[PDB]
Copies of this chain bind each other. A is one copy, B any other.
Amino acid sequence: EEKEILWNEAKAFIAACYQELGKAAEVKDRLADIKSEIDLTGSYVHTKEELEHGAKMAWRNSNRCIGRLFWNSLNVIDRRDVRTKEEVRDALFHHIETATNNGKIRPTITIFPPEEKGEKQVEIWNHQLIRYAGYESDGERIGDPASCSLTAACEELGWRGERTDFDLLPLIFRMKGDEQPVWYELPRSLVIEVPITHPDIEAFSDLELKWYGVPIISDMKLEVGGIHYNAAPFNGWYMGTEIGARNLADEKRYDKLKKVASVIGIAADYNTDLWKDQALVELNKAVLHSYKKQGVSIVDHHTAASQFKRFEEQAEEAGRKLTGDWTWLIPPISPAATHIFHRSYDNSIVKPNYFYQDKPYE
């Protein structure tokens, strides 16, 4: 019964995709080719053009993403030909290098072979390709708490972290048929990191903060016309609040606001002093300043929201419905200073899209 669902999704996807591509006349023959292929094989194989456009549609449909103005310029790398661990590893390394682009971040996705009959071909364990390890024992907190479970999984497989606050996790992924994942240390020459300084407050460097250049989300499933690409890591560039208001600020993450308050010279005693708010602003100013100073792409939430307004206008001009998730679109810093905060959005799910999938570990 698997193939009846697939056929329906493929009809809807091919019709819409060829329509947008001006190939509506070719729709008829391509679907017949598909229906034969499914009857014979149980599945079908996207053309390069369909795979590229489908990945772009999926970004355009991601309700939670403010960055969607640039959906059509996604650089799609087709790695459905991969068969071995070395090829997976090298394609992951290449993604890091080409997406980094010496700091001028190129929004990129690398697509690996899709699930066959819901059996995975490649299974990536990382949440992002570049991310810091986290440790918790004997009351000692080190690194990124969000990474505790994966870090413990990795250290069961014979990896061992230096237990700095910024250990790079290795790539870790499992191949079909294999029964433990392999892991590979990231070559440091491929990983750009940005030290956090402040434009005005020289003491800010006493915090010794840093973050990595490129967030490469490697654990979501791309669904295009009924085909499930569970391994399809992608990246944009950061919006600064993601680092300054969440990764470095959350009490469950690096929890740095009290130390930020101290180095910027304000007291952290009274809610009514709004010291957390003031610290959040200076930390977020430092993040943008540091990325720009180093020549690594980044966008602030005001410019990002302005770009998203253009996306909304572009949708309307193209007669496409806009969908969005207000609770994820508003930024966590001065949200009411953006137009997003002041309108509502239809949170309907349209496909192609990116979806969550269960982690292979605990």
Give, as a whole number of angstroms, the nearest-CB distance from A98 to chain B: 26
- Closest residue on chain B to residue A306 by CB atoms: B271
Give the chain B neighbours of A289 by CB distance below 8 A.
272
**In-complex Cβ contact of A341 among B277, B284, B332 (8 A):** B332
Give, as a whole number of angstroms, the nearest-CB distance from A174 to chain B: 32
- A335 contacts B335, C-beta separation under 8 Å: yes
Give the chain B neighbours of A332 by CB distance below 8 A.
334-336, 341
- A280 contacts B327, C-beta separation under 8 Å: no
17 A–B contacts from the bound complex (CB under 8 Å): A246-B336, A249-B337, A271-B306, A272-B303, A273-B285, A274-B300, A274-B302, A274-B333, A277-B284, A277-B333, A277-B337, A278-B281, A281-B281, A327-B327, A332-B334, A332-B335, A332-B341
Give the chain B neighbours of A39 by CB distance below 8 A.
none
Q: Does any Cβ of B come within 8 Å of A48's Cβ?
A: no
- Complex: A245 Cα to B274 Cα, angstroms: 13
- Complex: A273 Cα to B302 Cα, angstroms: 10
Knowing A271-B302, A271-B303 are in contact, say whether A337-B284 is a contact too (CB < 8 A).
no
Residues of A within 8 A of B (CB): 245-246, 249-250, 257, 271-274, 276-278, 280-281, 284-285, 288-289, 292, 300, 302-303, 306, 326-327, 332-337, 341
- Complex: A302 Cα to B271 Cα, angstroms: 6
Give the chain B neighbours of A337 by CB distance below 8 A.
249, 257, 276-277, 280
- Closest residue on chain B to residue A288 by CB atoms: B272
- B272 contacts A300, C-beta separation under 8 Å: yes
Give the chain B neighbours of A341 by CB distance below 8 A.
332
Give the chain B neighbours of A246 by CB distance below 8 A.
336
- Complex: A334 Cα to B336 Cα, angstroms: 11
- Complex: A334 Cα to B260 Cα, angstroms: 15
Give the chain B neighbours of A284 by CB distance below 8 A.
274, 277
- A334 contacts B272, C-beta separation under 8 Å: no
- Closest residue on chain B to residue A336 by CB atoms: B332
Give, as a whole number of angstroms, the nearest-CB distance from A52 to chain B: 32
Give the chain B neighbours of A274 by CB distance below 8 A.
281, 284-285, 288, 300, 302, 333
Query: 16 more A-B contacts (CB under 8 A) besides A250-B336, A280-B337, A281-B281?
Result: A245-B334, A249-B337, A271-B300, A271-B302, A271-B306, A272-B292, A272-B300, A272-B303, A274-B288, A276-B302, A276-B337, A277-B333, A277-B334, A332-B336, A332-B341, A333-B334
- Complex: A288 Cα to B257 Cα, angstroms: 21
- A277 contacts B272, C-beta separation under 8 Å: no
- Complex: A28 Cα to B303 Cα, angstroms: 63
Closest 10 CB pairs of A and B: A332-B336, A271-B302, A277-B334, A277-B281, A272-B288, A271-B303, A276-B337, A274-B285, A272-B300, A271-B300
Give the chain B neighbours of A280 by CB distance below 8 A.
334, 337
Of A274, A276, A280, A303, chain B has the most CB atoms within 10 Å of the CB of A274
Give the chain B neighbours of A276 by CB distance below 8 A.
302, 334, 337
Give, as a whole number of angstroms, the nearest-CB distance from A9 to chain B: 30
- Closest residue on chain B to residue A332 by CB atoms: B336
Give the chain B neighbours of A288 by CB distance below 8 A.
272, 274
Give the chain B neighbours of A300 by CB distance below 8 A.
271-272, 274
- Complex: A250 Cα to B246 Cα, angstroms: 25
Knowing A272-B292, A288-B272, A302-B271 are in contact, say whether A245-B336 is a contact too (CB < 8 A).
yes
